[PDB]
Design a protein around this ligand. Structure first.
Ligand SMILES: CO[C@@H]1O[C@H](COS(=O)(=O)O)[C@@H](O[C@@H]2O[C@H](CO)[C@H](O)[C@H](O)[C@H]2O)[C@H](O)[C@H]1NC(C)=O
Ligand SMILES: CO[C@@H]1O[C@H](COS(=O)(=O)O)[C@@H](O[C@@H]2O[C@H](CO)[C@H](O)[C@H](O)[C@H]2O)[C@H](O)[C@H]1NC(C)=O
Lengths: 133, 133
């Protein structure tokens, strides 16, 4: 795998800031958030060209080991061989993923945990900085 | 108990930067680096008021669950109720630790792992930023 962080104790309203390097030969990368590897309130998966998808962001949840229903976004502000920063927060309703250039995606909060304690990176994404503000 | 990061894959020469907030009533905090919770090539434990110790940095290793020979540092550039950054790197011989007011002490590499894959924080230290250079 890639970087795995636990015991984050990120509460609602708090911001998780992630900066990483997207491989020049990136097919996709993954940002997983939740309670643990089996309970993800956000599976954040920009696909450059992978699993039959091209320039498409695929989000999903994982509940008790069971993948939820995939959600897709039209816009794709990610370029291979580049640094990508992501700010994540959540409330009772949605997880919000903000990019600095103003892009903002919502994913419905399907798990309703009191905190994000788990973060995992995977695929063609190497994390350089992680911040909690 | 506090933040735990694994699969860091930190190689020699690479810099691991951690910045956090030292609680105003901090008695101590812990920074653990190694393969896992049983194999630490560096146990970084600034003690403000703890285990009978004052303004003392204690370092140690843990090999196969067994604590190594403890080492302590005299300088203590840590003030409670303040933000403290610590930069850590290593080679085959020593781990090098940079302290916030510019201090730098070496701790002998006793485990000889090819990489630091594991980091655990604990005690009166809340992490605000983690970076890999
Ligand atoms: C259903 O068709 C394709 O299924 C694969 C495999 O799904 S599964 O549930 O993992 O067995 C989908 O790829 C997977 O998607 C999940 C998120 O739901 C993870 O990203 C996982 O890493 C990935 O392999 C794929 O989306 C889907 N393809 C279509 C129809 O677009
Ligand atoms: C008399 O030596 C003291 O021993 C205690 C307990 O050591 S033990 O191996 O756990 O039995 C030391 O406290 C422990 O120190 C290690 C690192 O050496 C860890 O931080 C551990 O969390 C902590 O409980 C103590 O440092 C040591 N004190 C002196 C004065 O040597």
């Amino acid at each position: 795998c890639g970087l795995v962080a636990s015991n984050l104790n990120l509460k609602p309203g708090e911001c998780l800031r992630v900066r990483g390097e997207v491989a020049p030969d990136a097919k996709s990368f993954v940002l997983n958030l939740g309670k643990d590897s089996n309970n993800l309130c956000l599976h954040f998966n920009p696909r450059f060209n992978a699993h039959g998808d091209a320039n498409t962001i695929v989000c999903n949840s994982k509940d008790g080991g069971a993948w939820g229903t995939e959600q897709r976004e039209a816009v794709f502000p990610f370029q291979p061989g580049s640094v990508a920063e992501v700010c994540i927060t959540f409330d009772q309703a949605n997880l919000t993923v903000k990019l600095p250039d103003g892009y903002e995606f919502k994913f419905p909060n399907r798990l309703n945990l009191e905190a994000i304690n788990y973060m995992a990176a995977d695929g063609d994404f190497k994390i350089k900085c992680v911040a909690f503000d």
